[PDB]
Design a protein around this ligand. Structure first.
Ligand SMILES: CC(=O)N(O)CCCCCNC(=O)CCC(=O)N(O)CCCCCNC(=O)CCC(=O)N(O)CCCCCN
Ligand SMILES: [Fe+3]
Ligand SMILES: [Fe+3]
Ligand SMILES: [Mg+2]
Ligand SMILES: [Mg+2]
Length: 278
């Protein structure tokens, strides 16, 4: 019955049935184990930026990731509330409503894939889904290796990758050390063209002029992009001047969460493999 999390040890004499997750990677992880959410933070955002796996029908929006709705959470009476250390200032208030477990995929460890495995195992214990947890972990490692072997065998692993989130006309997040994207492509035997320092989420915020020092890369642009965002890239003199634009070496990915878990890594791996070996 005793579960350890980042704020100590909690006992559950029955598996918690009504589950709230207050970040999207914990939402993804709960869903990865075949468990439904009573509530999740910012469902319209999860739908836009995460997309899969699909949240269950009856899931209630319990506030923003930064501002949980305490009145609503009190009314819906969860059996467990899942947060990261990024919401630790809400630990004691949420604790008055229900048992709170603290799990952080993104920490100063900067090993998101390994953290998501550790956390998939803890939540597998919490929900009596340990076998399902071990298979999500094994299938993640299987898919990365197999996709890596395919890309390498096709002679497509030699060109380095640049992973970019569009922020505005003049601003990008480039994903490298500590990013889900980097843990994924490292496992697939690919090279990151970005070697600048990153925050604990695994990205550097940069100007778009920095792309000029990375023209030999295959550029992967995270989805989704708005019509206005995509027109800004299509029409930008800077982007159209870059070698990767002239050599058809720019790929727009679908909506896959850059701060997601094992299922995000699986989907990102599949889509990269598709684009590089089509
Ligand atoms: C976990 C992940 O979200 N993080 O960012 C990793 C990095 C967290 C850095 C600390 N900053 C914050 O915590 C503030 C909210 C934050 O999240 N920013 O992102 C700015 C809001 C974007 C506008 C408002 N929100 C959205 O657009 C939702 C998607 C967003 O959170 N992005 O991160 C993805 C697209 C960037 C635009
Ligand atoms: Fe939010
Ligand atoms: Fe964000
Ligand atoms: Mg999140
Ligand atoms: Mg990003």
């Amino acid at each position: 019955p005793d579960i350890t999390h980042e704020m100590g040890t909690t006992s559950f004499e029955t598996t918690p049935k009504k589950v709230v997750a207050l970040d999207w990677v914990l939402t993804e992880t709960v869903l990865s184990l075949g468990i439904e959410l009573e509530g999740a933070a910012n469902i319209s955002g999860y739908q836009q930026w995460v997309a899969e796996p699909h949240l269950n029908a009856d899931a209630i929006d319990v506030g923003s990731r930064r501002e949980p709705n305490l009145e609503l959470l009190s009314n819906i009476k969860p059996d467990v509330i899942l947060i990261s250390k990024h919401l630790a200032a809400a630990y004691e208030p949420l604790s008055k409503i229900a048992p709170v477990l603290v799990y952080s995929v993104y920490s100063e460890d900067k090993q998101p894939l390994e953290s998501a495995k550790r956390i998939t195992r803890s939540l597998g214990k919490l929900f009596d889904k340990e076998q399902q947890a071990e298979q999500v972990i094994a299938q993640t490692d299987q898919r990365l290796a197999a996709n890596g072997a395919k890309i390498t065998s096709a002679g497509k692993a030699e060109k380095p990758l640049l992973f970019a989130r569009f922020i505005n006309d003049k601003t990008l997040r480039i994903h490298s050390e500590g990013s889900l994207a980097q843990d994924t492509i490292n496992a697939m035997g690919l090279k990151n063209d970005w070697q600048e320092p990153t925050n604990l989420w695994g990205f550097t915020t940069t100007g778009t002029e920095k792309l000029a020092e990375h023209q030999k890369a295959n550029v992967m642009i995270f989805g989704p992009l708005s019509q206005e965002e995509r027109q800004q890239l299509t029409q930008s003199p800077l982007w159209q001047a870059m070698e990767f634009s002239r050599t058809d070496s720019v790929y727009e990915l679908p909506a896959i969460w850059t701060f997601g878990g094992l299922l995000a890594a699986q989907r990102l791996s599949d889509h990269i493999t598709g684009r590089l070996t089509q």
